[PDB]
Design a protein around this ligand. Structure first.
Ligand code: FES
Length: 104
């Protein structure tokens, strides 16, 4: 009603974060195994774009490229300084190989 289709699951390399426009909001999407996670692409610490940082599959953290703060991709929770405030997490469903993200 309606979500945003960003990509097909296998168009995403596992562990490689990308960003998509979801109804005006920029959203970082990343595959781990067969799971897909989505959070705001904008770091809460200062202006930086999380998809251009480093994804840590073992801990499910995205590391900001600018001051290397971290967020949990499952929840948007800040998990390493200097990030101290969470970013928005987006609900994601994979349906028939299509990755669908619920808009804000
Ligand atoms: S802008 Fe992301 S840690 Fe500073």
């Amino acid at each position: 009603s309606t979500p945003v289709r960003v990509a097909t699951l296998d168009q995403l390399k596992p562990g490689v974060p990308t960003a998509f426009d979801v109804d005006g909001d920029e959203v970082m999407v990343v595959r781990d195994g067969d799971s897909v996670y989505a959070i705001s692409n904008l770091c809460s610490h200062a202006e930086a774009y999380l998809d251009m940082g480093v994804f840590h599959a073992e801990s499910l953290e995205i590391e900001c490229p600018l001051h290397v703060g971290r967020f949990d991709v499952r929840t948007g929770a800040p998990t390493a300084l200097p990030c101290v405030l969470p970013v928005r997490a987006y609900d994601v469903v994979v349906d028939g190989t299509e990755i669908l993200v619920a808009p804000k």
